[PDB]
């Protein structure tokens, strides 16, 4: 099976999370393509992939709390080929904030409005992902089992 992983990361936490998930999928036999959201084009982005995993950090704001590199993709999510696609979301944040990992909720809700099939509840990481490595691996393991 082929999996696409797209992440938006400012300090490297969601990027570390994306690379950890990519290894667990590859070691289970999937062909994995991992890309920074700053370098992708939304048009037909998901065409040909069996599983798509989307990740991003949360930054408090009055208009949009998504990490800046992911905004352009999010705004054009309707042109990616999400209808009927198997997808799951993940993201890093901090529970001292009101909207803890709020970007994960925003992405799940829009994918749901576009007809995607959310395979598993989103992974929400508090603090340093390097200390939550077991939670990342287990989630990756559970997403493989819903495919
Ligand atoms: C100014 C600022 C605002 C932040 N706002 C939020 C927030 O609204 N919700 C949240 O869960 N985390 C918030 N964080 C925590 C970051 O999302 C967290 O540090 C995360 O690990 C960053 O991930 P990244 O390196 O992949 O960009 C904020 C951090 C800073 C510095």
Curated annotation (Swiss-Prot):
Residue ranges of domain Flavodoxin-like in the record: 3-144
A Pfam family this chain is assigned to: Flavodoxin_1
A GO molecular-function annotation: FMN binding
Alphabetical list of InterPro entries matching this protein: Flav_short (IPR010087), Flavdoxin-like (IPR001094), Flavodoxin (IPR050619), Flavodoxin/NO_synth (IPR008254), Flavodoxin_CS (IPR001226), Flavoprotein-like_sf (IPR029039)
Keyword Transit peptide: no
Top-rank taxon, per record: Bacteria
Keyword Disulfide bond applies: no
Cofactor(s) listed in the protein's UniProt record: FMN
Keywords for this protein: Electron transport, Flavoprotein, FMN, Transport
Function: Low-potential electron donor to a number of redox enzymes.
PANTHER family: FLAVODOXIN 1, FLAVODOXIN 2
Family from the record: Belongs to the flavodoxin family.
NCBIfam families given in the database record: flav_short (TIGR01753)
Protein name: Flavodoxin
